[PDB]
Design a protein around this ligand. Structure first.
Ligand code: HEM
Ligand code: HEM
Ligand SMILES: Cc1cc(N)nc(CCc2cncc(CCc3cc(C)cc(N)n3)c2)c1
Ligand SMILES: Cc1cc(N)nc(CCc2cncc(CCc3cc(C)cc(N)n3)c2)c1
Ligand SMILES: Cc1cc(N)nc(CCc2cncc(CCc3cc(C)cc(N)n3)c2)c1
Ligand SMILES: Cc1cc(N)nc(CCc2cncc(CCc3cc(C)cc(N)n3)c2)c1
Ligand SMILES: [Cl-]
Ligand SMILES: [Cl-]
Ligand SMILES: [Zn+2]
Ligand SMILES: [Zn+2]
Ligand SMILES: [Zn+2]
Lengths: 407, 411
């Protein structure tokens, strides 16, 4: 089963064979495409473990070897006895790197093999989780020279003793509903902020308040911890040409760190596995600042620019959007904090995709997420056909724990 | 059976039931999504079910389902197919069918307009000369001195597949492209292959940057024939910028009338291989796609040079800055010349209102996010955070391969 993908700018055609190794289901059918939908026992466990160990032993050119058979033997016995198994450190590192390699929504995967993996499987308490996370934040931040990292807490057992980070990202800003009816801070985080306050957090009640961590160890009720302020690197936003831009009082944090996803390796499930990289500029300047449901700053910026806001066809929104994104990139670069613009990032992804087709037989990719949220067609991913399918090991979305947890 | 779609900016949730009427396949499976793949004679047996499905839909839309007239029409079509292997649509059914192919076109952001379509019935056409006259009349009507009106012209349907009507042009109005011995291209690189065919057939090429191509028209399966659209029927707009006086000296212009001529219209199992249709432009089609695609006019560098932007590093966003100014110029120029055009903000806002109305009155609105989201400033338009469901309803417009690959040359 050879599927062709074409690039419409270059006419280059690539052949995908990797999709034949896909296992999980997409949500699409022959009758309906759901490509734009955001959320589309012992017996079960051994085939999953075997599938993974086969791929691992193949990667180190030891497939069918004594060491391969012996390990498969070992894992089988462990599952039959304990209803589960433990990954070797080599297997854990390989699995985490491949989960990133397989993440079809990630434009940054050229970097996949350079991931620092912190093994936190010996963690037993919420205070232990906090220490691990602080060390991750410090290592990853590296005074502005950011380094990709993942920290992996103990795997799910019976499902009643899950480790979870309640926060969606390790560093994010609070949001507060006002008597005015408006929102102060980040509207994305109003609900989580309320939970934090209810659990005892003393909120500063400002526009950019770094949220505390709510950490759940061993299925216990989550506990609150504040990340040491001096470990949270932030960048004030200014513009190279517009002196007034600084007076908007905008800032953002340097470290993008996802903490709400589930890492599946060899059928084992790691429900707390925070990971971090560095930002693409549009993530801050387009998504976080300009989404209507977020800080929604387009109107204020346009006003300061003296643009004709009376008609849409003046393209005042597009003009202000460009300037905000110029300011984001300028500010991070001036403060020596790693950032990538959308042109550079997409160029790198195409090179990565070409590498993956030649060395691996394909690269699953979700065009809806890969194409940047501004200036899509002038980047080299827009005219690139992509095939989206699910490979394991993988990162999977999991719902907010406050919808499931029983106190 | 219900599917839900969510808008991630507004939290508005809609419910689709219309997908139940979908027939044809998407290209996707349970194991693979092909959502970003651009390209993912019937027998008596298969035709009557297709005819019946269409006629049932038509008579339902006029509130005459199950009426004597409905039953009589089914009988009449049944007997026509069994006797002649095909059938003819009534004028009313043709109009309904063409409007619905547009309503159903999942890649079209302009569908709020679907019920306002002028249908020109050209099923009595027999020759390429006849096709040319119908096409000129379509261009003149649709252009309407700048007050653009949507229109479609429908030529005779397929019979045995050996007698097809085809417009060989991909669009009625488009510019020539010429590859030079040094490997550079003059004009529009999208049209080099078609231009060579025109020259080979006898066109005398001006060899400039914006030469309107001749029509190459195939009637009744015969070899195609060349015709020049009268220049006075081809409305064009020189591109200038409201603040930058040097913009005009880039020498840019574009034509006012976007008119697709290469698609197949399917109505009730019948196939109309020549059915040119036209509307009016969304600004980004010209300013982003036609001007800025690397494989097209590719003007970004030249514009950025004249703006004196910092072009040493991509992080200055020089390309983004130049792109906005080009698109401002396109909208300004069309508006100044009183030629209908819509900006991407207005167009997407109207589409979302159309979509919500369709969910309420029809139970759905199939839409292809990849094409619906504009090629610049996507996330600041209301379509970006809208979940969509893509599925195929008939009547429909389908892509067909370029006829120069398939045509049997008679001589
Ligand atoms: C090294 C720099 C990195 C860059 C520039 C980057 C870039 C991005 C971007 C731009 C997105 C989508 C955000 C949006 O569309 O608004 C994304 C998503 C994602 N990335 Fe990366 N990435 C990086 C590192 C990582 C790392 C280290 C991992 C895991 C080890 C990872 C895994 C993921 C996953 C799982 C998603 C989807 C997240 C979700 O579903 O919410 N990426 N990436
Ligand atoms: C009236 C104003 C109209 C506007 C503003 C408009 C807008 C557009 C746009 C922007 C595209 C996609 C182009 C791109 O992604 O670069 C498109 C595609 C399309 N539209 Fe419309 N449209 C209009 C009228 C029409 C009419 C009259 C019809 C047919 C009766 C039609 C049927 C289609 C079809 C079939 C496609 C897909 C074409 C393909 O696959 O090549 N549209 N429309
Ligand atoms: C409903 C829903 C589903 C889903 N799968 N993801 C989300 C969150 C999407 C999301 C929002 N902001 C931020 C991110 C993280 C993206 C990200 C992650 C990393 C590691 C690096 C980098 N530069 N960027 C992801 C929401
Ligand atoms: C839980 C939740 C609720 C809510 N109302 N919104 C969100 C954020 C939704 C969201 C908005 N913009 C951007 C993203 C990132 C993912 C993303 C999505 C799409 C469609 C394109 C693209 N390039 N990237 C996510 C999350
Ligand atoms: C390989 C391929 C497949 C496919 N389905 N379409 C194409 C052509 C895409 C395409 C390119 N330029 C222009 C259009 C026309 C879109 C269009 C059509 C109409 C009627 C009005 C309007 N404003 N815009 C379509 C190519
Ligand atoms: C026959 C043919 C060959 C070729 N190399 N390119 C083309 C045009 C491909 C093309 C390029 N940009 C734009 C389009 C329009 C359709 C389109 C495609 C996508 C991916 C997004 C979007 N918003 N709209 C089509 C056609
Ligand atoms: Cl966004
Ligand atoms: Cl484009
Ligand atoms: Zn799909
Ligand atoms: Zn967004
Ligand atoms: Zn393009």
């Amino acid at each position: 089963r050879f599927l062709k993908v074409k690039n419409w700018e270059t006419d280059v055609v690539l052949t995908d064979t990797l999709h034949l190794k896909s296992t999980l289901e997409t949500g699409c059918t022959e009758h309906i495409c759901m490509g734009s939908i955001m959320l589309p026992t012992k017996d079960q466990l051994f085939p999953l473990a075997k599938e993974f160990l086969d791929q691992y032993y193949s990667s180190i050119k030891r497939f069918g070897s004594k060491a391969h058979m012996d390990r498969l033997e070992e894992v089988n016995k462990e599952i039959e006895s304990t209803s589960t198994y433990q990954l070797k450190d080599t297997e854990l590192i390989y699995g985490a790197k491949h989960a990133w390699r397989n993440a079809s929504r990630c434009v940054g995967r050229i970097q996949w093999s350079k991931l620092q993996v912190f093994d936190a499987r010996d963690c037993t308490t919420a205070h232990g989780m906090f220490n691990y996370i602080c060390n991750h934040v410090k290592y990853a931040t590296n005074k502005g020279n950011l380094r990709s990292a993942i920290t992996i807490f103990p795997q799910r057992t019976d499902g009643k003793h899950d480790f979870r980070v309640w926060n969606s990202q390790l560093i994010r800003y609070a949001g507060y509903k006002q008597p005015d009816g408006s929102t102060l801070g980040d509207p994305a985080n109003v609900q989580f902020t309320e939970i934090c306050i209810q659990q005892g957090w003393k909120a500063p009640r400002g526009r950019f308040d770094v949220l505390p961590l709510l950490l759940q160890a061993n299925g216990n009720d989550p506990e609150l911890f504040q990340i040491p302020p001096e470990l949270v690197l932030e960048v004030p936003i200014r513009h190279p040409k517009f002196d007034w831009f600084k007076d908007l009082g905008l800032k953002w944090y340097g470290l993008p760190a996802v903490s709400n996803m589930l890492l599946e390796i060899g059928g084992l499930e790691f429900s707390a596995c925070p990971f971090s990289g560095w930002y693409m500029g549009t993530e801050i300047g387009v998504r976080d600042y300009c989404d209507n449901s977020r800080y929604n700053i387009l109107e204020e910026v346009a006003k300061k620019m003296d643009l004709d806001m009376r008609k849409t066809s003046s393209l005042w929104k597009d003009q202000a959007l460009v300037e905000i994104n110029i300011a984001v990139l300028y500010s991070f670069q001036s403060d020596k904090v790693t950032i990538v613009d959308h042109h550079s990032a997409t160029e790198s992804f195409i090179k990565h995709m070409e590498n993956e087709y030649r060395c691996r037989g394909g690269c699953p990719a979700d065009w809806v997420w890969i194409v940047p949220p501004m200036s899509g067609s002038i980047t080299p991913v827009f005219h690139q056909e992509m095939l989206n399918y699910r490979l394991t090991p993988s990162f999977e979305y999991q719902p907010d724990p406050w919808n499931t947890h029983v106190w």
